[PDB]
């Protein structure tokens with residue numbers, strides 16, 4: 001279709017007061033980045049709840065992807081799902097972000113802001129929802145087709161889901177963390193795609209981004225070894241075109257400079273005693 005441009009935002013959606021806010025709501029920055037990478041058994045139990053709720057919200061919003069829907073409506077459905085299940089939407093009020101999920105159409109790499117933009121036939125849309133409940137976070141995203149998606153765009157989406165799943169399969173105690181981005185990038189590059197560098201996955205727990213970084217490209221200089229009880233996301237963004245990007249005037253929305261489309265998937269993972277468990281169903 002035509003290159004995207006910003007629509008109009010709807011007003012802030014309320015959250016029932018009884019649902020606890022993360023500490024960072026309304027503040028310039030979050031108190032995150034230096035927390036332990038291995039979680040306690042108590043926190044891991046809590047993170048199974050938050051992950052399940054985030055995965056339900058993402059699935060409910062995904063069911064509404066269809067030509068003619070607005071990205072604001074996806075956000076209303078995600079928001080409603082989270083608050084009906086007792087969870088706060090972690091994006092809402094993180095460094096002022098104004099909505100309860102990120103909706104990233106077509107050439108939007110990440111961090112799209114739900115708004116009056118109407119989806120049309122052929123579009124792809126990433127919906128990224130995080131839930132905060134029991135003092136911990138759960139983060140997941142997926143890219144959904146709207147209507148009759150072109151073969152090159154269908155392939156990019158299915159190969160980005162494959163890359164994410166291949167990477168998840170490598171996770172176990174003792175594995176070098178660098179294998180994740182080796183597996184993602186070696187697979188994506190077979191088809192000539194380019195793996196985004198400047199946005200990464202991350203440890204997650206009682207804080208949204210806890211200071212652990214997970215790269216999605218090949219970077220053998222990272223020495224980090226995976227430990228039982230570590231919790232982190234794998235969330236590669238994969239481009240049909242070049243990596244060069246621009247940020248919109250809202251200071252959030254990241255778009256490819258060449259306007260070629262891009263796809264993402266994300267799960268929150270637990271390193272178990274023997275392998276990996278997807279906490280976001």
Ligand SMILES: CO[C@@H](C(=O)NC[C@@H]1CCCN(C(=O)C2CC2)C1)[C@H](O)[C@@H](O)[C@H](O)/C=C/C(C)(C)C
Nearest residue numbers: 032033091094097110111128199200202209210211
């Ligand atoms: C692609 O998006 C991921 C992403 O930017 N990661 C990079 C980390 C972003 C925050 C700062 N970082 C840290 O290491 C700091 C320790 C805190 C890098 C992000 O985690 C998404 O999955 C999440 O759903 C959206 C979060 C908002 C920022 C829109 C609310």
Ligand SMILES: [Mn+2]
Nearest residue numbers: 128139140141
């Ligand atoms: Mn996310």
Ligand SMILES: [Mn+2]
Nearest residue numbers: 139201233235
């Ligand atoms: Mn994330």
